[PDB]
């Protein structure tokens, strides 16, 4: 699809917000979550999700599905940099290793297993 944030304003915003977030919440990682177009799942608002570096991918994933209230009838899958992250990996580790030029993380979700 494309990055809505990157189209509108990212570099300046991400720089200032990263400084504020690192200063106030040094133990948290700044993530952006978007709904992949075409799947049957509910849509997501434009929000800046700040998760503690202590939790694992398993907990973060479970929170995204619980927040959007994913029923047992549908499935939910996550994607980061075109890869399937390991649920047991730590938020801080995945953040530091995948740390972008703007020091933020981009995660997309789908409610289908085959995106085509």
């Amino acid at each position: 699809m494309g990055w809505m944030f990157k189209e509108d304003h990212s570099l300046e915003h991400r720089c200032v917000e990263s400084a504020k977030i690192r200063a106030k919440y040094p133990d948290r990682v700044p993530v952006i979550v978007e709904k992949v177009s075409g799947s049957q799942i509910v849509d997501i608002d434009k929000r800046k999700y700040l998760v503690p570096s202590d939790i694992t991918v398993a907990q973060f994933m479970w929170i995204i599905r619980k927040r959007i209230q994913l029923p047992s009838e549908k499935a939910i899958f996550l994607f980061v940099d075109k890869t399937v992250p390991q649920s047991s990996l730590t938020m801080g580790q995945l953040y530091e290793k995948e740390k972008d030029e703007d020091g933020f993380l981009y995660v997309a979700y789908s409610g289908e297993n085959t995106f085509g």
């Binding site: 304003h9 948290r28 929000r47 800046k48 927040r67």
Partner: peptide
């Protein structure tokens, strides 16, 4: 520098999440 225009299209509200 802080081009925080009053015309923001995409909101991007901060949300601290943990569980």
């Amino acid at each position: 520098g802080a081009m925080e225009i009053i015309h923001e299209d995409n909101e991007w509200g901060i949300e601290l999440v943990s569980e």
